[PDB]
Amino acid sequence: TEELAENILKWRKQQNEVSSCIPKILAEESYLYKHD
Amino acid sequence: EILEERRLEMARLQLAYICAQHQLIHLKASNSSMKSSIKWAEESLHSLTSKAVDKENLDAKISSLTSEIMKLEKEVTQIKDRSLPAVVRENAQLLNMPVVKGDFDLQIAKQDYYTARQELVLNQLIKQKASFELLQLSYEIELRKHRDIY
Amino acid sequence: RRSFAQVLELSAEASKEAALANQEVWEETQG
Amino acid sequence: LEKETKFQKERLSDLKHMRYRIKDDLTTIRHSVVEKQGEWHKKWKEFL
Amino acid sequence: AQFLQNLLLPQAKRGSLPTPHDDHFGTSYQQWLSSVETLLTNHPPGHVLAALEHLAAEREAEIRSLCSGDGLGDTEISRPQAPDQSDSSQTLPSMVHLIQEGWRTVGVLVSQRSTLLKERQVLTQRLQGLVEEVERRVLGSSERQVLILGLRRCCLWTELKALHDQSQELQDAAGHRQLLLRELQAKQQRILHWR
């Protein structure tokens, strides 16, 4: 029970940090595509 | 408040789904484009060592490539303004039927039971009316027999 | 039993938040 | 026996604590979700 | 009972034209009269009363058997279901749980997009180095113009093909959505006709 507790909270924090890190990756890719 | 929250929850599912598939569409189209760019750059870098284009042929292929670029660009422009977003908006607005099919099926599974049991009650009343009509008809036949023997 | 109930509810809400963040970032970068 | 009883009472205390803190995380996540959807709905209502 | 059922056959529920069953008013009545003639001639009214009491008890016990449906376990009494309704009682997810599974699908899409970031950023450098190698080779201005035009053409044709593929895939999704919607509206008219 508490094992699945830290499991679920680590998945939620992991996806949250991914959602917050998508901006920089997309900005870098878009500026690389927009630059010849 | 709970029904308003759940209707809002469905509307927020549509809110996300308005762009959620559109992101995948744009990402896959861009990825196909840059794979094709990689393959064309590779193929042409290999071909220019072997095949040399004449200057008149260079200008002729410039005209041919550009004339196909204008058609490809207008056909791509046709599929980025009111064709993709309307389709994904329709798909978002058609996110209701998982709820509606279950909500209809529960009540229909109850309604077949209602129809069967109410028809059973109707047939019970029909059988009772049949028995009462039989008994009254027997009484009338007895009365006719009494009058005829009289 | 109620713990599984709020685990599923928070899973739905966290995936909802991930969808919102991704949608917002796509509108930020792509436009 | 009294040792097991003290561990299960500490256990249920920890369970109620984790229930309350994941409830607080639910409230924070829902608040962020509500704000983001308000912003998106206003922006795309102006857009469309 | 057939006579009264023809009397109480619902006229609006009849899909065909309504049938005025005056032949059932007459011929079934004559057959009933013959049967009642045999019944009264062969039998006394006293055991007619006894058998009618027995059949009234039969009908009462027939209702009592359905009234006795509380023999099941009295734990969270809800969902009055059809007699032996187990196989068709699929666990349809509720108002929240369908949206839970939908958000699971969108989270899978989010993970797919996160992998798409790594894939796109890794394979971007291949095109970047390819165009840099185009710039590096000793080629004329017209040759590089043909190279740029062909690179853009190879972008646009396959991008247009992918746009068609994704648009038709989501239109097929909307078509499946409407194929589910037709059942919804048909069931709605079924409920209205039930009312």
Nearest to E195 by CA among A10, B111, D24, B20: B111
B95 and C CB contact within 8 Å: no
User: Which CB contacts under 8 angstroms, 24+ apart, belong to C21-24?
Assistant: C21/A16, C21/A19, C21/A20, C21/A22, C21/D36, C22/A19, C22/A22, C22/B20, C22/B23, C22/E110, C22/E113, C23/B15, C23/B16, C23/B19, C23/B20, C23/B23, C23/D40, C24/D36, C24/D39, C24/D40
Question: Contact at 8 Å (CB) between E164 and B32?
Answer: no
Q: Which of C9, C14, C15 has its CB closest to that of E96?
A: C9
Cβ contacts of B32 within 8 Å, gap of 6 or more: E158, E159, E161, E162
Cβ contacts of B70 within 8 Å, gap of 6 or more: none
Question: Please, what sign has the CA dihedral across residues E182, E187, E193, E195?
Answer: negative
- Distances from the Cα of B97 to the Cαs of B91, E1, E6, E181, in angstroms? 11, 43, 39, 6
Cβ contacts of C10 within 8 Å, gap of 6 or more: A8, A12, D22, D25, D26, D29
Q: Which of A1, A12, A30 has its CB closest to that of C14?
A: A12
In chain E, alpha helices (H): 2-7, 22-42, 45-67, 95-136, 141-194
Which H or E run contains D28? helix D2-47
Query: Which chain E residue has the Cα nearest residue C26?
Result: E113
What is the number of residues in chain C? 31
Cβ contacts of C12 within 8 Å, gap of 6 or more: E96, E99, E100, E103, E104
Between chains, do D44 and B18 touch, taking CB under 8 Å as contact?
Answer: yes
Interface test with A, best of D19, D21, D22 (most A CBs within 10 A): D22
Nearest to C16 by CA among B93, D30, B5, B54: D30
Phi, psi torsion values for E30, nearest 5 degrees: -70, -40
Interface test with A, best of C11, C13, C29, C30 (most A CBs within 10 A): C29
Residue with tokens 């029904």: B3
Q: How far is CA B77 from the centre of its chain?
A: 27
Surface-to-core class of residue B69, CB atoms within 10 Å of its CB (0-12 exposed, 13-18 middle, 19+ buried): middle
Q: How far is E183 from chain A (nearest CA, A)?
A: 38
Q: Please tell me the distance from the alpha carbon of residue B114 to that of residue A9, in angstroms, as a whole number.
A: 47
In chain A, alpha helices (H): 2-33
Q: Please tell me the distance from the alpha carbon of residue B72 to that of residue E161, in angstroms, as a whole number.
A: 10
Q: Count Cβ atoms below 10 Å from residue E41 Cβ, excluding itself.
A: 7
Is residue E84 helix, strand or coil?
coil
Q: Measure the N-to-C terminal CA separation of chain D; round to a whole number of Å.
A: 68
Q: Please tell me the distance from the alpha carbon of residue B98 to that of residue E35, in angstroms, as a whole number.
A: 56
Residue with tokens 């469309």: D48
Q: What is the resolution of this structure in A?
A: 8.0
Q: How far is CA E99 from the centre of its chain?
A: 18
Sequential DSSP letters for B61-107: HHHHHHHHHHHHHHHHHTTSSSSHHHHHHHHHHT--HHHHHHHHHHH
Q: Please tell me the distance from the alpha carbon of residue E82 to that of residue B117, in angstroms, as a whole number.
A: 10
Nearest to E104 by CA among B81, B87, C18: C18
Is residue B42 helix, strand or coil?
helix
E144 and C CB contact within 8 Å: no
Q: Please tell me the distance from the alpha carbon of residue B23 to that of residue E155, in angstroms, as a whole number.
A: 18
- Could you say which DSSP state residue E72 is in? S
